[PDB]
Design a protein around this ligand. Sequence first.
Ligand code: HEM
Ligand code: HEM
Ligand SMILES: [C-]#N
Ligand SMILES: [C-]#N
Lengths: 142, 142
Amino acid sequence: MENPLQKARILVNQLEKYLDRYAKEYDVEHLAGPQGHLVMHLYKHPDKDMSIKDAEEILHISKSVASNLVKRMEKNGFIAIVPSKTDKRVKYLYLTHLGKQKATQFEIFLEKLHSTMLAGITKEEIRTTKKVIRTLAKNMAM
Amino acid sequence: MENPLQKARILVNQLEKYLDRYAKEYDVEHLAGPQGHLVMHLYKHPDKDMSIKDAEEILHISKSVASNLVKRMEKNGFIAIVPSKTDKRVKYLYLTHLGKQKATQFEIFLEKLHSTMLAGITKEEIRTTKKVIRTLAKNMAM
Ligand code: HEM
Ligand code: HEM
Ligand SMILES: [C-]#N
Ligand SMILES: [C-]#N
């Protein structure tokens, strides 16, 4: 008589469009997913080294994905990839000047995005919503 | 650092898979969307006539969609389409014996689907979830 599926897909689509437009305004296109995670990780932990191997573990991705991801981040100019001097088979990642800028813009983006999105919704309402979604998922799992 | 989009798409996909499997078990494949709405409408109001024109208005669809929908329902054997005797340009819809069976199975399906899906979730929790979803949508609408 009525369909919450189509309703739900329309909403997720809207959310994606919203997110994309918002990211463009903050000039952090590309950072929405795993690029942004890695940029923010590198940005928050600049004392420490990160090999591609480390990035695999931190993002929980495969060798081929991590490989593609970092090559694209290098293309973007967000990171440098420099082989270990001692063992030129270990590859270390360095967040560039541009990568640091991208990180600072991403943080602002995230702050403003949540303020806009979550206006007039309480921490409790969120907790409730999260419990419901999560009970639904469980109820379906056969 | 994390993505509720992909999370949300995975959940809707799961829900669609759940729904499909559930519908097959109740033998009401095809009825999930507009076919089922029309079958249930016809089933609940058998005193009254429904032209294709009426079905357009009741489902809020276009002439070409309604046309395709009813031809498919006729293929399925859920309805007969009989032109008005007086004016063979008005087309009336009749829910067949099989269409009535489909309707009764659909009602049971819907009852069991909601019981399973909504186990351990209160009317209040639902109302809260619905308010949140709805505030989100509003917050995004530019
Ligand atoms: C690219 C998209 C997004 C990213 C990268 C992201 C990332 C994050 C992160 C890291 C936090 C934790 C903040 C902290 O406490 O340290 C957070 C909080 C939250 N996010 Fe997102 N988020 C995104 C989009 C969304 C969307 C689309 C929604 C809802 C539609 C959402 C709902 C929330 C909620 C409810 C919180 C908790 C707010 C709080 O800190 O009290 N997020 N997000
Ligand atoms: C083919 C799929 C579905 C159809 C045709 C459908 C149709 C309906 C209809 C007609 C009602 C109103 C019952 C009444 O009070 O007369 C209802 C109730 C409801 N549906 Fe659905 N529904 C479907 C799937 C879902 C799904 C997937 C969800 C959630 C994931 C959902 C959530 C609800 C809720 C919360 C109610 C209110 C329950 C109540 O009566 O208290 N429905 N549904
Ligand atoms: C039920 N929607
Ligand atoms: C934020 N998830």
